[PDB]
Amino acid sequence: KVFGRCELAAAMKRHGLDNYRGYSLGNWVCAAKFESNFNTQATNRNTDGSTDYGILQINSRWWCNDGRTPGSRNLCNIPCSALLSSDITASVNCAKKIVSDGNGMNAWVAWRNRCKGTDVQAWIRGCR
Ligand SMILES: C[C@@H](O)CN1CCN(CC(=O)O)CCN(CC(=O)O)CCN(CC(=O)O)CC1
Ligand SMILES: C[C@@H](O)CN1CCN(CC(=O)O)CCN(CC(=O)O)CCN(CC(=O)O)CC1
Ligand SMILES: [Gd]
Numbered sequence: 001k002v003f004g005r006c007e008l009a010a011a012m013k014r015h016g017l018d019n020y021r022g023y024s025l026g027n028w029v030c031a032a033k034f035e036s037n038f039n040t041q042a043t044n045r046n047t048d049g050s051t052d053y054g055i056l057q058i059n060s061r062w063w064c065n066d067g068r069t070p071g072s073r074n075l076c077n078i079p080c081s082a083l084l085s086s087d088i089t090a091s092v093n094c095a096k097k098i099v100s101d102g103n104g105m106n107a108w109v110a111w112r113n114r115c116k117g118t119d120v121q122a123w124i125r126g127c128r
């Protein structure tokens with residue numbers, strides 16, 4: 001599924017991402033745009049053999065099981081394919097664990113380089 005901007009904002013709010021660990025809703029919508037272009041089915045391979053999955057590009061090295069990242073962990077206790085669903089519940093719940101690990105939203109490279117230090121409220125402007 002490819003989300004609309006306000007559609008995604010509303011879904012993220014309902015699942016409790018707004019102000020989670022002090023990150024306002026606009027931060028999360030910005031992150032999703034540049035990580036996946038709002039597409040739940042996005043995947044990208046990394047150089048070490050791991051793969052990033054879903055709307056927030058969660059990495060198989062630590063967070064989910066894809067059966068082809070030998071020596072990896074599965075800290076969200078899910079198959080990586082669960083992160084590609086039209087229902088974003090699994091992605092949101094796993095992202096909550098990631099952002100809580102000590103590095104905050106710096107775990108998302110696109111957020112650090114394209115969202116951090118900007119007017120992030122602009123990403124939810126106009127939404128009901
Ligand atoms: C809770 C997260 O920390 C999970 N973590 C995966 C689990 N392991 C071991 C462990 O963290 O117990 C990773 C080891 N490693 C360095 C280290 O931790 O010393 C990578 C660091 N990151 C994040 C960070 O450490 O801030 C990856 C996410
Ligand atoms: C193996 C290293 O990870 C050692 N580690 C010291 C041991 N403890 C607890 C533990 O790591 O089991 C530290 C707790 N803490 C984060 C956390 O662990 O959750 C501090 C961060 N760093 C590294 C990192 O975790 O990224 C400190 C180095
Ligand atoms: Gd760690």
Ligand code: NA
Nearest residue numbers: 098103104107
């Ligand atoms: Na983090």
